[PDB]
Design an enzyme around this catalytic site. Structure first.
Site, PDB file in Angstrom:
ATOM      1  N   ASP A 149       0.818  -1.234   0.000  1.00  0.00           N
ATOM      2  CA  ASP A 149       0.000   0.000   0.000  1.00  0.00           C
ATOM      3  C   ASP A 149       0.851   1.284   0.000  1.00  0.00           C
ATOM      4  OD1 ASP A 149      -2.965   0.334  -0.146  1.00  0.00           O
ATOM      5  OD2 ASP A 149      -2.702   1.693   1.532  1.00  0.00           O
ATOM      6  N   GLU A 192     -12.195  -6.056 -21.594  1.00  0.00           N
ATOM      7  CA  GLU A 192     -12.097  -6.475 -22.981  1.00  0.00           C
ATOM      8  C   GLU A 192     -12.585  -7.896 -23.139  1.00  0.00           C
ATOM      9  OE1 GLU A 192      -8.057  -5.965 -24.227  1.00  0.00           O
ATOM     10  OE2 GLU A 192      -7.847  -3.977 -23.432  1.00  0.00           O
ATOM     11  N   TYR A 211      -6.136  -0.150 -32.721  1.00  0.00           N
ATOM     12  CA  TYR A 211      -4.826  -0.698 -32.980  1.00  0.00           C
ATOM     13  C   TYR A 211      -4.905  -2.151 -32.559  1.00  0.00           C
ATOM     14  CZ  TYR A 211      -4.724   0.944 -28.106  1.00  0.00           C
ATOM     15  OH  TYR A 211      -5.011   1.153 -26.783  1.00  0.00           O
ATOM     16  N   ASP A 212      -3.851  -2.898 -32.809  1.00  0.00           N
ATOM     17  CA  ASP A 212      -3.837  -4.345 -32.558  1.00  0.00           C
ATOM     18  C   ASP A 212      -4.887  -4.964 -33.472  1.00  0.00           C
ATOM     19  OD1 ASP A 212      -1.964  -5.709 -30.824  1.00  0.00           O
ATOM     20  OD2 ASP A 212      -3.579  -6.486 -29.587  1.00  0.00           O
ATOM     21  N   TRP A 253      -1.451   3.726 -26.207  1.00  0.00           N
ATOM     22  CA  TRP A 253      -0.917   2.789 -25.234  1.00  0.00           C
ATOM     23  C   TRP A 253       0.516   2.429 -25.637  1.00  0.00           C
ATOM     24  CZ3 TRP A 253      -1.921  -0.208 -20.938  1.00  0.00           C
ATOM     25  CH2 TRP A 253      -1.059  -1.326 -20.791  1.00  0.00           C
TER      26      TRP A 253
HETATM   27  C1  LIG Z   1      -6.237 -18.166 -34.644  1.00  0.00           C
HETATM   28  C2  LIG Z   1      -7.043 -18.707 -33.796  1.00  0.00           C
HETATM   29  C3  LIG Z   1      -8.059 -19.317 -32.908  1.00  0.00           C
HETATM   30  O1  LIG Z   1      -8.121 -18.604 -31.681  1.00  0.00           O
HETATM   31  C4  LIG Z   1      -9.243 -17.721 -31.543  1.00  0.00           C
HETATM   32  C5  LIG Z   1      -8.784 -16.256 -31.615  1.00  0.00           C
HETATM   33  C6  LIG Z   1      -7.258 -16.177 -31.402  1.00  0.00           C
HETATM   34  C7  LIG Z   1      -9.264 -15.560 -32.899  1.00  0.00           C
HETATM   35  O2  LIG Z   1      -8.751 -16.408 -33.935  1.00  0.00           O
HETATM   36  C8  LIG Z   1      -8.558 -15.894 -35.281  1.00  0.00           C
HETATM   37  O3  LIG Z   1      -7.549 -15.264 -35.574  1.00  0.00           O
HETATM   38  N1  LIG Z   1      -9.500 -16.184 -36.157  1.00  0.00           N
HETATM   39  C9  LIG Z   1      -9.381 -15.820 -37.562  1.00  0.00           C
HETATM   40  C10 LIG Z   1      -9.381 -14.310 -37.750  1.00  0.00           C
HETATM   41  C11 LIG Z   1     -10.300 -13.816 -38.859  1.00  0.00           C
HETATM   42  C12 LIG Z   1     -11.103 -12.613 -38.352  1.00  0.00           C
HETATM   43  N2  LIG Z   1     -10.212 -11.513 -37.935  1.00  0.00           N
HETATM   44  C13 LIG Z   1     -10.191 -11.024 -36.689  1.00  0.00           C
HETATM   45  N3  LIG Z   1     -11.002 -11.576 -35.869  1.00  0.00           N
HETATM   46  N4  LIG Z   1      -9.422  -9.935 -36.407  1.00  0.00           N
HETATM   47  C14 LIG Z   1      -9.610  -9.168 -35.315  1.00  0.00           C
HETATM   48  O4  LIG Z   1     -10.499  -9.358 -34.484  1.00  0.00           O
HETATM   49  N5  LIG Z   1      -8.747  -8.198 -35.066  1.00  0.00           N
HETATM   50  C15 LIG Z   1      -8.709  -7.560 -33.748  1.00  0.00           C
HETATM   51  C16 LIG Z   1      -8.821 -14.073 -32.931  1.00  0.00           C
HETATM   52  C17 LIG Z   1      -9.471 -13.226 -34.017  1.00  0.00           C
HETATM   53  C18 LIG Z   1      -9.111 -13.385 -31.621  1.00  0.00           C
HETATM   54  O5  LIG Z   1     -10.216 -12.904 -31.438  1.00  0.00           O
HETATM   55  O6  LIG Z   1      -8.075 -13.318 -30.580  1.00  0.00           O
HETATM   56  C19 LIG Z   1      -8.248 -12.483 -29.430  1.00  0.00           C
HETATM   57  C20 LIG Z   1      -7.268 -11.310 -29.540  1.00  0.00           C
HETATM   58  C21 LIG Z   1      -7.473 -10.461 -30.767  1.00  0.00           C
HETATM   59  C22 LIG Z   1      -8.035 -13.269 -28.113  1.00  0.00           C
HETATM   60  C23 LIG Z   1      -6.604 -13.847 -28.094  1.00  0.00           C
HETATM   61  O7  LIG Z   1      -8.180 -12.355 -27.008  1.00  0.00           O
HETATM   62  C24 LIG Z   1      -9.119 -14.373 -27.899  1.00  0.00           C
HETATM   63  O8  LIG Z   1     -10.339 -13.839 -27.357  1.00  0.00           O
HETATM   64  C25 LIG Z   1     -11.466 -14.727 -27.384  1.00  0.00           C
HETATM   65  C26 LIG Z   1     -12.390 -14.387 -28.557  1.00  0.00           C
HETATM   66  C27 LIG Z   1     -12.189 -14.497 -26.067  1.00  0.00           C
HETATM   67  O9  LIG Z   1     -11.106 -16.117 -27.499  1.00  0.00           O
HETATM   68  C28 LIG Z   1      -9.857 -16.604 -26.941  1.00  0.00           C
HETATM   69  C29 LIG Z   1      -8.737 -15.545 -26.967  1.00  0.00           C
HETATM   70  C30 LIG Z   1      -8.422 -15.121 -25.531  1.00  0.00           C
HETATM   71  C31 LIG Z   1      -9.447 -17.933 -27.628  1.00  0.00           C
HETATM   72  C32 LIG Z   1      -8.362 -18.670 -26.834  1.00  0.00           C
HETATM   73  C33 LIG Z   1      -8.948 -17.750 -29.067  1.00  0.00           C
HETATM   74  C34 LIG Z   1      -9.940 -18.003 -30.215  1.00  0.00           C
HETATM   75  C35 LIG Z   1     -10.420 -19.451 -30.156  1.00  0.00           C
HETATM   76  O10 LIG Z   1     -11.072 -17.113 -30.198  1.00  0.00           O
HETATM   77  C1  LIG Z   2      -1.951  -3.812 -22.762  1.00  0.00           C
HETATM   78  C2  LIG Z   2      -1.912  -5.060 -22.560  1.00  0.00           C
HETATM   79  C3  LIG Z   2      -1.874  -6.486 -22.342  1.00  0.00           C
HETATM   80  O1  LIG Z   2      -1.486  -6.739 -21.004  1.00  0.00           O
HETATM   81  C4  LIG Z   2      -0.045  -6.671 -20.866  1.00  0.00           C
HETATM   82  C5  LIG Z   2       0.657  -7.996 -21.259  1.00  0.00           C
HETATM   83  C6  LIG Z   2      -0.255  -9.181 -21.592  1.00  0.00           C
HETATM   84  C7  LIG Z   2       1.633  -7.766 -22.408  1.00  0.00           C
HETATM   85  O2  LIG Z   2       0.858  -7.718 -23.610  1.00  0.00           O
HETATM   86  C8  LIG Z   2       1.114  -6.615 -24.484  1.00  0.00           C
HETATM   87  O3  LIG Z   2       1.808  -5.712 -24.103  1.00  0.00           O
HETATM   88  N1  LIG Z   2       0.465  -6.582 -25.639  1.00  0.00           N
HETATM   89  C9  LIG Z   2       0.308  -5.360 -26.440  1.00  0.00           C
HETATM   90  C10 LIG Z   2      -1.064  -5.377 -27.146  1.00  0.00           C
HETATM   91  C11 LIG Z   2      -2.189  -4.669 -26.387  1.00  0.00           C
HETATM   92  C12 LIG Z   2      -3.655  -5.179 -26.625  1.00  0.00           C
HETATM   93  N2  LIG Z   2      -4.607  -4.642 -25.624  1.00  0.00           N
HETATM   94  C13 LIG Z   2      -4.622  -3.325 -25.411  1.00  0.00           C
HETATM   95  N3  LIG Z   2      -3.936  -2.547 -26.163  1.00  0.00           N
HETATM   96  N4  LIG Z   2      -5.354  -2.846 -24.421  1.00  0.00           N
HETATM   97  C14 LIG Z   2      -5.395  -1.538 -24.135  1.00  0.00           C
HETATM   98  O4  LIG Z   2      -4.941  -0.597 -24.852  1.00  0.00           O
HETATM   99  N5  LIG Z   2      -5.959  -1.262 -22.964  1.00  0.00           N
HETATM  100  C15 LIG Z   2      -6.093   0.143 -22.626  1.00  0.00           C
HETATM  101  C16 LIG Z   2       2.748  -8.854 -22.527  1.00  0.00           C
HETATM  102  C17 LIG Z   2       3.924  -8.279 -23.323  1.00  0.00           C
HETATM  103  C18 LIG Z   2       3.277  -9.376 -21.206  1.00  0.00           C
HETATM  104  O5  LIG Z   2       4.201  -8.837 -20.668  1.00  0.00           O
HETATM  105  O6  LIG Z   2       2.668 -10.511 -20.529  1.00  0.00           O
HETATM  106  C19 LIG Z   2       3.399 -11.150 -19.477  1.00  0.00           C
HETATM  107  C20 LIG Z   2       3.815 -12.554 -19.933  1.00  0.00           C
HETATM  108  C21 LIG Z   2       4.776 -12.453 -21.105  1.00  0.00           C
HETATM  109  C22 LIG Z   2       2.510 -11.205 -18.241  1.00  0.00           C
HETATM  110  C23 LIG Z   2       1.206 -11.958 -18.528  1.00  0.00           C
HETATM  111  O7  LIG Z   2       3.120 -12.023 -17.256  1.00  0.00           O
HETATM  112  C24 LIG Z   2       2.392  -9.697 -17.812  1.00  0.00           C
HETATM  113  O8  LIG Z   2       3.570  -9.170 -17.182  1.00  0.00           O
HETATM  114  C25 LIG Z   2       3.651  -7.740 -17.091  1.00  0.00           C
HETATM  115  C26 LIG Z   2       4.589  -7.154 -18.137  1.00  0.00           C
HETATM  116  C27 LIG Z   2       4.221  -7.412 -15.712  1.00  0.00           C
HETATM  117  O9  LIG Z   2       2.359  -7.122 -17.255  1.00  0.00           O
HETATM  118  C28 LIG Z   2       1.255  -7.800 -16.610  1.00  0.00           C
HETATM  119  C29 LIG Z   2       1.171  -9.299 -16.972  1.00  0.00           C
HETATM  120  C30 LIG Z   2       0.907 -10.174 -15.753  1.00  0.00           C
HETATM  121  C31 LIG Z   2      -0.056  -7.030 -16.943  1.00  0.00           C
HETATM  122  C32 LIG Z   2      -1.198  -7.491 -16.017  1.00  0.00           C
HETATM  123  C33 LIG Z   2      -0.492  -7.118 -18.426  1.00  0.00           C
HETATM  124  C34 LIG Z   2       0.281  -6.251 -19.427  1.00  0.00           C
HETATM  125  C35 LIG Z   2      -0.134  -4.795 -19.274  1.00  0.00           C
HETATM  126  O10 LIG Z   2       1.699  -6.328 -19.224  1.00  0.00           O
END
Ligand SMILES: C#CCO[C@@H]1[C@@H](C)[C@H](OC(=O)NCCCCNC(=N)NC(=O)NC)[C@@H](C)C(=O)O[C@H](CC)[C@@](C)(O)[C@@H]2OC(C)(C)O[C@H]([C@@H]2C)[C@H](C)C[C@@]1(C)O
Ligand SMILES: C#CCO[C@@H]1[C@@H](C)[C@H](OC(=O)NCCCCNC(=N)NC(=O)NC)[C@@H](C)C(=O)O[C@H](CC)[C@@](C)(O)[C@@H]2OC(C)(C)O[C@H]([C@@H]2C)[C@H](C)C[C@@]1(C)O
Length: 498
Positions: free
Chosen positions: A67, A143, A213-214, A402
């Site tokens: 804290d 998200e 983005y992303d 970001w």
């Molecule tokens: C590749 C692959 C299959 O993986 C899928 C997952 C990986 C999807 O698979 C995939 O690529 N499908 C064909 C894409 C064409 C359309 N284009 C598209 N959707 N683009 C887009 O949204 N841009 C931002 C992917 C689109 C997705 O939604 O992944 C998100 C991040 C962008 C995840 C990684 O957060 C994802 O989020 C949800 C939807 C909750 O599902 C899980 C996963 C945590 C899951 C583990 C992943 C899972 C099953 O959907």
């Molecule tokens: C932003 C984001 C995604 O989350 C990251 C973490 C998932 C990072 O992902 C990342 O930077 N991806 C860029 C794409 C952005 C798509 N979403 C997005 N832009 N959202 C947004 O704008 N919100 C306002 C990764 C590089 C990472 O460091 O993850 C490590 C493992 C490799 C963790 C899972 O251990 C991670 O370790 C640290 C670096 C300490 O961060 C924590 C987290 C526990 C944290 C809770 C998550 C964290 C901020 O980095």
């Protein structure tokens, strides 16, 4: 007359809080003092990321956060306000890790908004936290909520709003009212989870932060720019999922709003918001990345763009192969798929084989390594000009990014934005936006100004005819029509008058 917002996320991990220091770039690379006074002018807000929601459905810190050490870090931020008239130190609850469908804390977000009792408990806990540390507002970066849990999410936002208003009053803060924002989806697939209820989601917000983005990643079949402004016809297209949202609109109204396939661009996400009634441009904020997304395994021929690739999509990164040539951050942070703009400018500037190229359709930059088949999509001060023009032209509320800790130590990305809006010397009127593909969708929130002969009763109107009537311009879907425009399904409202 009013200033465009500049919303900079700021991230620091729990372990860097508990071992916090201002002088050891090994224990804390980007500490608070990194943010100059001149920088603190450049931002309107700073979203301190991230808090979460514990088993009791309350807003909280990471259970192993200390804290006092946590407290000291915030005052250092809130201190920045001395340098700036308008600065807000928001705190952001969520992030991808905590809140994704299979994140650690996911169920807590679902249950915290599920009931009135819980929303009461949770909303109070947000404000309690906000005051108890000196924060100027709340950001919710869940998200993303799904359909069943959107109504509760809405209600939650409303509750918090009321409590922020009560606190604004209490502390006499009318000069600088406690604010409420969310980080919103920047792409149709995720946006479709709450699209139909977008106006209700936005109503209690000062801004909606579009995560534009992303939009490309390892999950895709094909390399693509992650934050293309406009569409390139050579690039991949996607299914417009918003045409299947629960909107209750007709075939024509859907088709006109949701062209499919379409290009997954920034312009696309913004127009999609504008298309809804009750969503004012002024509340819409454009996200931009201060990082780069990196791919490997790209067959050459076209800068590594739109290529098949061998980039793993697993979480976490499943091995020790750091293929992103000459990125130390990737080694230390243990993931070669993401790199800060800081680390990217190094990589390029150095002796490395990377070639910065430019897409004149998407107005974004990208690195191509020809030897090792690498591709990197990212944003820089050059693309930021075209994104700065768009914000102006479309009358959006401003910009989010970001994050701040991924700008360089000087902070030229931040400074480049500040320049494109504010700096009086700067100008961008001649800047060519190009022949990139626009999202042409029209909805009831973004009707173009038109004219047409006034409707006359008794006249038979053929398919396609346009008339003026009660403030709007209308078009017949088939012929021959005699009804008053708007009185039956034959008429389509296509624009507004004067
Ligand atoms: C590749 C692959 C299959 O993986 C899928 C997952 C990986 C999807 O698979 C995939 O690529 N499908 C064909 C894409 C064409 C359309 N284009 C598209 N959707 N683009 C887009 O949204 N841009 C931002 C992917 C689109 C997705 O939604 O992944 C998100 C991040 C962008 C995840 C990684 O957060 C994802 O989020 C949800 C939807 C909750 O599902 C899980 C996963 C945590 C899951 C583990 C992943 C899972 C099953 O959907
Ligand atoms: C932003 C984001 C995604 O989350 C990251 C973490 C998932 C990072 O992902 C990342 O930077 N991806 C860029 C794409 C952005 C798509 N979403 C997005 N832009 N959202 C947004 O704008 N919100 C306002 C990764 C590089 C990472 O460091 O993850 C490590 C493992 C490799 C963790 C899972 O251990 C991670 O370790 C640290 C670096 C300490 O961060 C924590 C987290 C526990 C944290 C809770 C998550 C964290 C901020 O980095």
């Amino acid at each position: 007359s009013t200033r465009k917002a500049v919303i900079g996320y700021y991230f620091i991990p729990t372990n860097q809080i508990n071992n916090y220091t201002e002088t050891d770039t090994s224990v804390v690379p980007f500490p608070v003092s990194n943010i100059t006074p001149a920088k603190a002018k450049q931002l309107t807000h700073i979203n301190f990321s991230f808090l979460d929601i514990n088993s009791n459905l309350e807003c909280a810190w990471d259970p192993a956060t200390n804290d006092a050490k946590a407290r000291d870090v915030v005052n250092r931020l809130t201190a920045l306000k001395a340098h700036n008239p308008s600065l807000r130190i928001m705190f952001s609850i969520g992030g991808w890790y905590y809140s994704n469908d299979l994140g650690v804390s996911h169920a807590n977000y679902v249950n915290a908004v599920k009931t009135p009792a819980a929303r009461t408990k949770f909303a109070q806990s947000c404000v309690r936290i906000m005051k108890d540390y000196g924060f100027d507002g709340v950001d919710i970066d869940w998200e993303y909520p799904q359909a069943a849990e959107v109504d509760g999410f809405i209600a939650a936002l409303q509750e918090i709003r009321t409590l922020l208003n009560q606190q604004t009053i209490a502390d006499g803060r009318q000069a600088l009212p406690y604010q409420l924002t969310i980080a919103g989806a920047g792409g149709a697939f995720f946006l479709s989870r709450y699209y139909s209820k977008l106006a209700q989601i936005v109503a209690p917000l000062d801004y909606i932060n579009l995560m534009t983005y992303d939009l490309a990643g390892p999950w895709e079949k094909i390399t693509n720019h992650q934050a293309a402004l406009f569409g390139d016809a050579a690039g991949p297209t996607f299914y417009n999922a918003l045409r299947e949202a629960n909107l209750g609109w007709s075939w024509e109204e859907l088709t006109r709003a949701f062209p499919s396939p379409f290009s997954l661009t920034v312009d696309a996400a913004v127009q999609q918001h504008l298309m809804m009634e009750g969503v004012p441009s002024a509340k819409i904020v454009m996200g931009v990345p201060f990082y780069g997304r990196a791919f490997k395994g790209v067959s050459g021929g076209n800068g590594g763009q739109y290529s098949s690739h061998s980039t793993p999509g697993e979480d976490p990164y499943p091995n020790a192969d750091y293929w992103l040539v000459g990125c130390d951050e990737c080694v230390r942070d243990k993931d070669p798929r993401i790199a800060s703009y800081r680390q990217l400018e190094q990589m390029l500037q150095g002796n490395y084989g990377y070639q910065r190229l430019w897409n004149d359709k998407t107005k974004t930059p990208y690195l191509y390594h020809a030897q090792n088949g690498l591709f990197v999509t990212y944003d820089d001060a050059e693309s930021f000009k075209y994104k700065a023009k768009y914000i102006k032209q479309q009358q959006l509320g401003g910009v989010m990014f970001w994050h701040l800790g991924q700008d360089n130590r000087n902070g030229d990305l931040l400074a480049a934005l500040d320049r494109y809006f504010n700096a009086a010397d700067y100008d961008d009127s001649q800047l060519d936006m190009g022949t990139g593909l626009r999202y042409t969708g029209v909805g009831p929130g973004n009707l173009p100004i038109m004219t047409a002969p006034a409707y006359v009763p008794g006249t038979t109107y053929a398919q396609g005819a346009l008339v003026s009537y009660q403030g709007y311009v209308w078009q017949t879907k088939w012929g021959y029509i005699t009804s008053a425009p708007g009185s039956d399904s034959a008429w389509l409202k296509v624009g507004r008058l004067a």
